[PDB]
Design an enzyme around this catalytic site. Structure first.
Site, PDB file in Angstrom:
ATOM      1  N   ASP A  15       0.801  -1.241   0.000  1.00 20.61           N
ATOM      2  CA  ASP A  15       0.000   0.000   0.000  1.00 20.61           C
ATOM      3  C   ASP A  15       0.837   1.296   0.000  1.00 20.61           C
ATOM      4  O   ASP A  15       0.310   2.373   0.335  1.00 20.61           O
ATOM      5  CB  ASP A  15      -1.057  -0.019   1.134  1.00 20.61           C
ATOM      6  CG  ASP A  15      -0.463  -0.203   2.506  1.00 20.61           C
ATOM      7  OD1 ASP A  15       0.800   0.029   2.683  1.00 20.61           O
ATOM      8  OD2 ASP A  15      -1.272  -0.528   3.426  1.00 20.61           O
ATOM      9  N   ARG A  29       1.042   6.878   0.203  1.00 21.19           N
ATOM     10  CA  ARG A  29       0.285   5.852   0.922  1.00 21.19           C
ATOM     11  C   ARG A  29      -1.138   5.819   0.310  1.00 21.19           C
ATOM     12  O   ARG A  29      -1.802   6.836   0.175  1.00 21.19           O
ATOM     13  CB  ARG A  29       0.230   6.260   2.412  1.00 21.19           C
ATOM     14  CG  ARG A  29      -0.631   5.345   3.312  1.00 21.19           C
ATOM     15  CD  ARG A  29      -0.118   3.886   3.367  1.00 21.19           C
ATOM     16  NE  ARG A  29      -0.772   3.099   4.458  1.00 21.19           N
ATOM     17  CZ  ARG A  29      -1.981   2.518   4.341  1.00 21.19           C
ATOM     18  NH1 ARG A  29      -2.682   2.599   3.180  1.00 21.19           N
ATOM     19  NH2 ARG A  29      -2.449   1.792   5.385  1.00 21.19           N
ATOM     20  N   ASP A  34      -5.641  -1.146   3.658  1.00 21.45           N
ATOM     21  CA  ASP A  34      -4.538  -1.588   4.521  1.00 21.45           C
ATOM     22  C   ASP A  34      -4.164  -2.937   3.986  1.00 21.45           C
ATOM     23  O   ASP A  34      -4.959  -3.880   4.063  1.00 21.45           O
ATOM     24  CB  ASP A  34      -5.030  -1.647   5.952  1.00 21.45           C
ATOM     25  CG  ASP A  34      -3.886  -1.897   6.959  1.00 21.45           C
ATOM     26  OD1 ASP A  34      -2.783  -1.432   6.666  1.00 21.45           O
ATOM     27  OD2 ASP A  34      -4.138  -2.536   8.005  1.00 21.45           O
ATOM     28  N   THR A  35      -2.962  -3.024   3.431  1.00 22.79           N
ATOM     29  CA  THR A  35      -2.354  -4.305   3.129  1.00 22.79           C
ATOM     30  C   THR A  35      -1.571  -4.857   4.327  1.00 22.79           C
ATOM     31  O   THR A  35      -1.094  -4.126   5.134  1.00 22.79           O
ATOM     32  CB  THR A  35      -1.384  -4.208   1.930  1.00 22.79           C
ATOM     33  OG1 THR A  35      -0.439  -3.135   2.130  1.00 22.79           O
ATOM     34  CG2 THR A  35      -2.186  -3.913   0.608  1.00 22.79           C
ATOM     35  N   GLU A  37       1.597  -6.057   6.414  1.00 19.47           N
ATOM     36  CA  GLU A  37       3.047  -5.762   6.301  1.00 19.47           C
ATOM     37  C   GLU A  37       3.721  -6.959   5.621  1.00 19.47           C
ATOM     38  O   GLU A  37       3.156  -8.085   5.615  1.00 19.47           O
ATOM     39  CB  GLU A  37       3.694  -5.373   7.647  1.00 19.47           C
ATOM     40  CG  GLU A  37       2.978  -4.270   8.452  1.00 19.47           C
ATOM     41  CD  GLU A  37       2.996  -2.861   7.810  1.00 19.47           C
ATOM     42  OE1 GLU A  37       4.044  -2.496   7.225  1.00 19.47           O
ATOM     43  OE2 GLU A  37       1.967  -2.099   7.887  1.00 19.47           O
ATOM     44  N   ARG A  75       4.023  11.277   3.919  1.00 23.02           N
ATOM     45  CA  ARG A  75       3.541  10.473   2.754  1.00 23.02           C
ATOM     46  C   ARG A  75       2.356  11.135   2.071  1.00 23.02           C
ATOM     47  O   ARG A  75       1.443  11.618   2.745  1.00 23.02           O
ATOM     48  CB  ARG A  75       3.135   9.035   3.187  1.00 23.02           C
ATOM     49  CG  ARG A  75       4.237   8.325   3.944  1.00 23.02           C
ATOM     50  CD  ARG A  75       3.892   6.908   4.318  1.00 23.02           C
ATOM     51  NE  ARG A  75       2.795   6.904   5.275  1.00 23.02           N
ATOM     52  CZ  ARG A  75       2.269   5.788   5.784  1.00 23.02           C
ATOM     53  NH1 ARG A  75       2.786   4.594   5.489  1.00 23.02           N
ATOM     54  NH2 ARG A  75       1.164   5.869   6.556  1.00 23.02           N
TER      55      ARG A  75
HETATM   56  C1  LIG Z   1      -4.091   5.552   5.053  1.00 29.08           C
HETATM   57  C2  LIG Z   1      -3.784   6.627   6.121  1.00 29.08           C
HETATM   58  C3  LIG Z   1      -2.862   6.311   7.136  1.00 29.08           C
HETATM   59  N1  LIG Z   1      -2.575   7.273   8.061  1.00 29.08           N
HETATM   60  C4  LIG Z   1      -1.679   7.034   9.233  1.00 29.08           C
HETATM   61  C5  LIG Z   1      -2.547   6.372  10.330  1.00 29.08           C
HETATM   62  C6  LIG Z   1      -1.558   5.397  10.975  1.00 29.08           C
HETATM   63  O1  LIG Z   1      -0.844   6.066  12.121  1.00 29.08           O
HETATM   64  P1  LIG Z   1       0.079   5.097  13.030  1.00 29.08           P
HETATM   65  O2  LIG Z   1       1.388   5.078  12.266  1.00 29.08           O
HETATM   66  O3  LIG Z   1       0.151   6.034  14.238  1.00 29.08           O
HETATM   67  O4  LIG Z   1      -0.482   3.729  13.207  1.00 29.08           O
HETATM   68  C7  LIG Z   1      -0.604   5.012   9.817  1.00 29.08           C
HETATM   69  C8  LIG Z   1      -1.025   3.739   9.101  1.00 29.08           C
HETATM   70  O5  LIG Z   1      -0.188   3.557   7.941  1.00 29.08           O
HETATM   71  P2  LIG Z   1       0.484   2.171   7.662  1.00 29.08           P
HETATM   72  O6  LIG Z   1      -0.608   1.105   7.461  1.00 29.08           O
HETATM   73  O7  LIG Z   1       1.254   2.452   6.419  1.00 29.08           O
HETATM   74  O8  LIG Z   1       1.353   1.778   8.833  1.00 29.08           O
HETATM   75  O9  LIG Z   1      -0.710   6.105   8.914  1.00 29.08           O
HETATM   76  C9  LIG Z   1      -3.216   8.539   7.996  1.00 29.08           C
HETATM   77  O10 LIG Z   1      -2.954   9.449   8.847  1.00 29.08           O
HETATM   78  N2  LIG Z   1      -4.063   8.859   7.027  1.00 29.08           N
HETATM   79  C10 LIG Z   1      -4.416   7.927   6.091  1.00 29.08           C
HETATM   80  O11 LIG Z   1      -5.250   8.228   5.247  1.00 29.08           O
HETATM   81 CA   LIG Z   2      -0.135  -1.438   5.864  1.00 31.62          CA
END
Ligand SMILES: Cc1cn([C@H]2C[C@H](OP(=O)(O)O)[C@@H](COP(=O)(O)O)O2)c(=O)[nH]c1=O
Ligand SMILES: [Ca+2]
Length: 129
Positions: A15, A29, A34-35, A37, A75
Protein backbone atom coordinates in the site's frame (compact mmCIF):
# COMPACT_ATOMS: atom_id res chain seq x y z
CA UNK A 1 -11.58 14.73 -8.09
CA UNK A 2 -8.85 14.94 -10.76
CA UNK A 3 -6.14 12.59 -11.99
CA UNK A 4 -2.63 14.06 -12.16
CA UNK A 5 0.51 12.68 -13.69
CA UNK A 6 3.32 10.86 -11.90
CA UNK A 7 6.07 8.36 -12.70
CA UNK A 8 7.27 5.33 -10.76
CA UNK A 9 10.53 5.76 -8.84
CA UNK A 10 10.33 2.41 -6.99
CA UNK A 11 8.01 -0.11 -5.37
CA UNK A 12 7.84 -0.22 -1.61
CA UNK A 13 5.05 -2.52 -0.38
CA UNK A 14 1.34 -3.39 -0.91
CA UNK A 15 0.00 0.00 0.00
CA UNK A 16 3.01 2.38 -0.42
CA UNK A 17 5.03 3.29 -3.48
CA UNK A 18 7.69 5.90 -4.37
CA UNK A 19 6.57 8.17 -7.24
CA UNK A 20 7.79 11.38 -8.76
CA UNK A 21 4.99 13.91 -8.51
CA UNK A 22 5.36 17.56 -9.80
CA UNK A 23 9.01 16.62 -10.37
CA UNK A 24 9.70 15.71 -6.64
CA UNK A 25 10.18 12.22 -5.17
CA UNK A 26 7.38 11.36 -2.73
CA UNK A 27 6.30 8.20 -0.96
CA UNK A 28 2.53 7.74 -1.50
CA UNK A 29 0.29 5.85 0.92
CA UNK A 30 -2.86 4.45 -0.77
CA UNK A 31 -6.13 5.96 0.59
CA UNK A 32 -8.79 3.82 2.27
CA UNK A 33 -6.86 0.49 2.35
CA UNK A 34 -4.54 -1.59 4.52
CA UNK A 35 -2.35 -4.31 3.13
CA UNK A 36 -0.61 -6.73 5.51
CA UNK A 37 3.05 -5.76 6.30
CA UNK A 38 5.57 -7.72 4.22
CA UNK A 39 6.22 -9.81 7.40
CA UNK A 40 2.53 -10.81 7.80
CA UNK A 41 0.47 -13.38 5.97
CA UNK A 42 -0.35 -12.15 2.39
CA UNK A 43 2.17 -9.31 2.90
CA UNK A 44 4.50 -10.61 0.23
CA UNK A 45 1.56 -11.26 -2.17
CA UNK A 46 0.23 -7.73 -1.63
CA UNK A 47 3.65 -6.19 -2.24
CA UNK A 48 4.00 -8.27 -5.40
CA UNK A 49 0.61 -7.37 -6.64
CA UNK A 50 1.14 -3.64 -6.28
CA UNK A 51 4.72 -3.78 -7.62
CA UNK A 52 3.56 -5.53 -10.76
CA UNK A 53 0.55 -3.34 -11.34
CA UNK A 54 2.55 -0.09 -11.00
CA UNK A 55 5.70 -1.05 -12.93
CA UNK A 56 3.78 -2.68 -15.82
CA UNK A 57 1.68 0.46 -16.34
CA UNK A 58 2.44 2.88 -19.15
CA UNK A 59 0.72 5.76 -17.36
CA UNK A 60 0.62 6.22 -13.55
CA UNK A 61 -1.70 8.83 -12.15
CA UNK A 62 -2.38 10.16 -8.71
CA UNK A 63 -5.75 11.48 -7.54
CA UNK A 64 -5.96 13.37 -4.29
CA UNK A 65 -9.21 13.43 -2.33
CA UNK A 66 -10.84 16.55 -0.76
CA UNK A 67 -8.94 16.50 2.56
CA UNK A 68 -5.39 16.26 3.72
CA UNK A 69 -2.90 15.41 0.94
CA UNK A 70 0.00 14.33 3.14
CA UNK A 71 -0.09 12.33 6.34
CA UNK A 72 1.93 12.85 9.57
CA UNK A 73 4.94 10.97 8.09
CA UNK A 74 4.97 13.26 4.98
CA UNK A 75 3.54 10.47 2.75
CA UNK A 76 1.19 11.68 -0.01
CA UNK A 77 -2.37 10.36 0.44
CA UNK A 78 -3.96 9.46 -2.92
CA UNK A 79 -5.80 7.01 -5.10
CA UNK A 80 -3.16 5.62 -7.51
CA UNK A 81 -4.16 4.50 -11.04
CA UNK A 82 -2.25 2.23 -13.36
CA UNK A 83 -3.39 2.56 -17.00
CA UNK A 84 -6.72 3.93 -15.74
CA UNK A 85 -7.26 1.09 -13.19
CA UNK A 86 -7.31 2.06 -9.49
CA UNK A 87 -4.70 0.12 -7.50
CA UNK A 88 -6.53 0.79 -4.23
CA UNK A 89 -9.68 -0.87 -5.60
CA UNK A 90 -7.81 -3.71 -7.27
CA UNK A 91 -6.05 -4.70 -4.04
CA UNK A 92 -9.37 -4.79 -2.18
CA UNK A 93 -11.17 -6.69 -5.01
CA UNK A 94 -8.45 -9.37 -4.86
CA UNK A 95 -8.64 -9.79 -1.08
CA UNK A 96 -5.06 -8.45 -0.67
CA UNK A 97 -6.23 -5.39 1.33
CA UNK A 98 -8.99 -4.42 3.74
CA UNK A 99 -10.93 -1.20 3.52
CA UNK A 100 -9.42 0.77 6.40
CA UNK A 101 -8.39 4.17 7.59
CA UNK A 102 -11.62 5.88 6.46
CA UNK A 103 -11.27 9.43 7.71
CA UNK A 104 -14.11 11.94 7.12
CA UNK A 105 -13.29 14.26 4.26
CA UNK A 106 -10.85 11.92 2.44
CA UNK A 107 -13.41 9.24 1.69
CA UNK A 108 -14.74 9.84 -1.82
CA UNK A 109 -14.23 6.25 -3.04
CA UNK A 110 -15.32 4.51 0.19
CA UNK A 111 -18.33 2.78 -1.03
CA UNK A 112 -16.72 1.74 -4.43
CA UNK A 113 -14.06 0.06 -2.33
CA UNK A 114 -16.54 -1.53 0.15
CA UNK A 115 -18.39 -2.98 -2.85
CA UNK A 116 -15.14 -4.58 -3.96
CA UNK A 117 -14.39 -5.91 -0.46
CA UNK A 118 -17.87 -7.52 -0.35
CA UNK A 119 -17.21 -9.32 -3.58
CA UNK A 120 -13.71 -10.49 -2.48
CA UNK A 121 -15.10 -11.77 0.79
CA UNK A 122 -17.98 -13.53 -1.10
CA UNK A 123 -15.35 -15.30 -3.24
CA UNK A 124 -13.29 -16.06 -0.12
CA UNK A 125 -10.13 -14.56 -1.68
CA UNK A 126 -6.80 -14.46 0.00
CA UNK A 127 -7.28 -12.58 3.33
CA UNK A 128 -10.92 -13.79 3.37
CA UNK A 129 -10.00 -17.44 2.81
C1 LIG B 1 -4.09 5.55 5.05
C2 LIG B 1 -3.78 6.63 6.12
C3 LIG B 1 -2.86 6.31 7.14
N1 LIG B 1 -2.58 7.27 8.06
C4 LIG B 1 -1.68 7.03 9.23
C5 LIG B 1 -2.55 6.37 10.33
C6 LIG B 1 -1.56 5.40 10.98
O1 LIG B 1 -0.84 6.07 12.12
P1 LIG B 1 0.08 5.10 13.03
O2 LIG B 1 1.39 5.08 12.27
O3 LIG B 1 0.15 6.03 14.24
O4 LIG B 1 -0.48 3.73 13.21
C7 LIG B 1 -0.60 5.01 9.82
C8 LIG B 1 -1.02 3.74 9.10
O5 LIG B 1 -0.19 3.56 7.94
P2 LIG B 1 0.48 2.17 7.66
O6 LIG B 1 -0.61 1.11 7.46
O7 LIG B 1 1.25 2.45 6.42
O8 LIG B 1 1.35 1.78 8.83
O9 LIG B 1 -0.71 6.11 8.91
C9 LIG B 1 -3.22 8.54 8.00
O10 LIG B 1 -2.95 9.45 8.85
N2 LIG B 1 -4.06 8.86 7.03
C10 LIG B 1 -4.42 7.93 6.09
O11 LIG B 1 -5.25 8.23 5.25
CA1 LIG C 1 -0.13 -1.44 5.86
Amino acid sequence: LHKEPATLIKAIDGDTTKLMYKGQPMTFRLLLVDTPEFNEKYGPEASAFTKKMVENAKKIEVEFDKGQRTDKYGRGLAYIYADGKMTNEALVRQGLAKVAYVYKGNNTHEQLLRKAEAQAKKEKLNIWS
